Amino acid sequence: TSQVRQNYHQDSEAAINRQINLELYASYVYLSMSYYFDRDDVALKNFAKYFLHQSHEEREHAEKLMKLQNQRGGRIFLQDIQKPDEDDWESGLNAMEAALHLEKNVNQSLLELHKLATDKNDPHLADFIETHYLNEQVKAIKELGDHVTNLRCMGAPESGLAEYLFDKHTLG
Amino acid sequence: TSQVRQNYHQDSEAAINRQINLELYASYVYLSMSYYFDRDDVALKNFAKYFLHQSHEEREHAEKLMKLQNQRGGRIFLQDIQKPDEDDWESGLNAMEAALHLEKNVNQSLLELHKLATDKNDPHLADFIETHYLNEQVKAIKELGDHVTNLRCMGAPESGLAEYLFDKHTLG
Amino acid sequence: TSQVRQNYHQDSEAAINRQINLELYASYVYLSMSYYFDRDDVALKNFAKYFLHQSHEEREHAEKLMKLQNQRGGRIFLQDIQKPDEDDWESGLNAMEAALHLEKNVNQSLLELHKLATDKNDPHLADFIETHYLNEQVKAIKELGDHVTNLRCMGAPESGLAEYLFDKHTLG
Amino acid sequence: TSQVRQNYHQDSEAAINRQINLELYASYVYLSMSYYFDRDDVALKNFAKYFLHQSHEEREHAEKLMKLQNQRGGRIFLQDIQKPDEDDWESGLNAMEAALHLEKNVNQSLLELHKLATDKNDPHLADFIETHYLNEQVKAIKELGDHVTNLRCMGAPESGLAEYLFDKHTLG
Ligand SMILES: [Ca+2]
Ligand SMILES: [Ca+2]
Ligand SMILES: [Ca+2]
Ligand SMILES: [Ca+2]
Ligand SMILES: [Ca+2]
Ligand SMILES: [Ca+2]
Ligand SMILES: [Fe+3]
Ligand SMILES: [Fe+3]
Ligand SMILES: [Fe+3]
Ligand SMILES: [Fe+3]
Ligand SMILES: [Fe+3]
Ligand SMILES: [Fe+3]
Ligand SMILES: [Fe+3]
Ligand SMILES: [Fe+3]
Incomplete structure (x- = not known):
């Protein structure tokens, strides 16, 4: 259908659409985390900055996948962006662990996309x-993983001093 | 109850959460339009740039409303961002018209928020x-509206020459 | 009657005079707190600096309200600035909490001024x-509120180490 | 018998020589198109410059492949660079279509070279x-593809104005 499409399987096009959805969902999760740390009852401003940056970066990776879909003659097909599973992220250690899990999932789906591309x-x-x-x-x-380790060694989350100093020293 | 909450009724907190979801929806629609115009069989680079900037601006407003929610002692509650009810935006004029209606709806909802706020x-x-x-x-x-008027006056959508030149002279 | 007075009811003139006295009171309280933190047996230099800047900012607002009174054709009527109902502010966390309540009261009185103004x-x-x-x-x-939350999370007021480090990392 | 040769299969060597020829040929085609647009009866200056830049870049690709042949210890065997299929390229849109077809062919043999290499x-x-x-x-x-799409939407080749405006705006 497209004059530029070449060697671009319809499974690859659907898989790219699904990966776009996943990157946008990660961006949403990171956004919710960020503004969770903006609350006056948490007030960890550099955690907020760190998570907001990662949220913009995930949005950028989604935009680049959409660019890639158009580059290959594929056609972009967007789905609902599901809300995150949690609205209260408990702590900075717990936010960092949920992000660790989120990146592991995104990576695993990227590795499946690679094996599909190769086969x-x-x-x-x-x-x-x-x-x-x-x-x-x-x-x-x-x-x-580094951040998770450091927060845990410092005595987080039971130590709010730990989270404060990490926010100041590592995320500063 | 927040330690900072003061004179922030629950109706306006909920309407702010709804407005956050609406502004995230608006940026999703603009993002879809932007990459529609990046397709190889549309290829209007400045329409694409224009709608991607609109997308980022809407995301910045959603984040501003999140910031205000936290500032006022409210709780951010995120719901799913509904996928745009269109995949193919047909043309630059039609995209501008859809954006005009989107923004008009966002505006009347903002006025309803204001009416509630002063109520x-x-x-x-x-x-x-x-x-x-x-x-x-x-x-x-x-x-x-100016954009819609120019593209119409130029012969859009019948003549792709109008859309091409508008993309170069106005969106450039 | 002033040559410049127009649409300036007497209730709002009197409420402006009251708000002037309130803002002068606020800066007096902040000044007392600031030099409490300059005592040799407290010695938290950045808490002191923070509250002295808050003091000057409140004085600048009182002067702004005086300027508005004169701008509107009203008459500035000054009453005594009541001495702060405290001499010893006990600790940095307690000082921040007292400031939080002071500002909250000032804010609701500002909203009452606005409600009168739109009435x-x-x-x-x-x-x-x-x-x-x-x-x-x-x-x-x-x-x-953020300040209160951090100092609490850090172990204040039990551990003076929390107050010391907050004074260095946040108020620095 | 190369002292540097390692894991470099005789088929890879030959396929690299064939790719070198193909890139020099792509360079020759672009050169012929460019000087077609320098004709006094065509006189599309920016089409000319665009295809001259494509020709210089295709020959740089050829030289990179010759350098790669030497790095791996294979031997450069050069062949005739064939003249292009056409002396007269008819129009800017027809030239762009031939370029798109030619590059899809170059891409197909590059993909075959990659399949060979991983085999x-x-x-x-x-x-x-x-x-x-x-x-x-x-x-x-x-x-x-983008260029072809724009030439077509603008009404090329029937409209000489379309190709003139494209020469001035997209290619200038
Ligand atoms: Ca690689
Ligand atoms: Ca439809
Ligand atoms: Ca007392
Ligand atoms: Ca180029
Ligand atoms: Ca020949
Ligand atoms: Ca590889
Ligand atoms: Fe990613
Ligand atoms: Fe990621
Ligand atoms: Fe908006
Ligand atoms: Fe808007
Ligand atoms: Fe004030
Ligand atoms: Fe104040
Ligand atoms: Fe090439
Ligand atoms: Fe090329």
Whole structure:
């Protein structure tokens, strides 16, 4: 149907649409986390900044997947963006752990998208996933794990002083 | 009860949560339009840029309303962002017309929020709506109307030459 | 009658005079708190700086209300500035809590001034209150609530280590 | 017998020589199109410049492939660069269509080279093809499609004005 489409399986196009939805959902979760930390009864402003930045970055990765869909002659098909599963994120340690899990899920779905690209012999799609998503997911997961470890060693969440100082020193 | 809450009725808290979801919906619609215009068989780069900037601006307003919710002692409650009821926006003129109607609906809902706010003797929320949304939406609807009028006067949608030149001279 | 007076009822003139005295009272309380934190047996320099700046800001608002009184054709009538009902503010957390309540009271009195202003069909005074006081007091109360929340979460007032570090990392 | 040769299959060597020829040919086609638009009876200056830049870039791609052949220890075997199919390219839209077809063909043989390379477990050759050729081809095809779409929507080739305005706005 598209004059530019070449070597671009319809499974790959649907999988790209689903991945776009996933990146937008991650962006939504991060947004809710961020403004949770903006509440006057939490007031961890750098946690808020950190999560809001990650939310904009997930939105950027969704926009790049939409660009990629148009680049391949695919056609973008958007779904509802589900609300996050929680509205109260308990603590900075618990937010960081939910984000760790969220990035692990996103990575796993990216790895399935890669294996689909490879078994459909679409090396452009495989290398796009590699170059723009795979190492970024690994760096994100490593950094979240670092934060989780530090918060836990400092005595979070029972130690609110721990979360305050982490907000000041690591997220500052 | 919040330690900062003062003169913030529950109706306006809920209407703010609804307005947050509405502004997130608006940016979703603009994002869909933007990448429709990035398709290989549409290829109007400045229409795409225009709607992507509108998208980001709507997201910034949603975040501003979240900030106000937290500022007022309210609780942010996020619901699903409904997918745009359209996939193919047909043309630049039709996209501008749909944006005009979207913004008009957002505007009347903002006025209903303001009417509720002044009904409940909450002058900070009313002036906030005024200050940060009312004239912004008026200018936005006026701009979109100008865009619609120009594209129509130029021969859109029958002549793709009109849409091409509007994309270059106005959206450029 | 003034040569410039127009649509300035006597109730709002008197309420402006009362608000002038209230804002002078607020700055007096902040000044007392500031130098409490300068005592040799308290010695939290940035708490002191913070409350002295709040004091000067309240004095600037009192002077702004005086300027508005003169602008509207009214007569400034000054009454005694009542001494703060406390000498010893006990701790940084308790000082922040007292400031939170002070500002909350000032805010509801500002809303009563606005309600009177819109009762009397005086839209300039109402928008002036909005513009120059309503969102300022909202931001102030939110900031003080954040401060209270952090100091509490950090272990104040039991651990003077929390107050020391808050003084360094947040008020610094 | 190359002292540097390692994991470089004789089929990979030959396929690289064929790709070198194909890129020099793409360069020749672009050169012929560019000087067709420099004709006094066509005289579309920016079409000319665009296709000259495409020709210089295609020959840089050829030289990168020759350098790759040497890095891997294979041997450059060059062949005739065939003259293009057409001397007269008819119009700007027809030229853009021929360019789109030509680049889709270059892309198909690049994908075949990647399949060969991964069939021979030559991951260096694969990743080289990926990062220096495959996304550049995907972007080139997307861009030519966009151009064709605009020429068509504007009413080319029947409207000489459409191609004039496209020359001035998109290509200038
Ligand atoms: Ca790769
Ligand atoms: Ca429809
Ligand atoms: Ca006492
Ligand atoms: Ca020949
Ligand atoms: Ca690879
Ligand atoms: Ca280019
Ligand atoms: Fe991501
Ligand atoms: Fe991510
Ligand atoms: Fe808006
Ligand atoms: Fe808007
Ligand atoms: Fe004040
Ligand atoms: Fe104040
Ligand atoms: Fe090439
Ligand atoms: Fe090329």
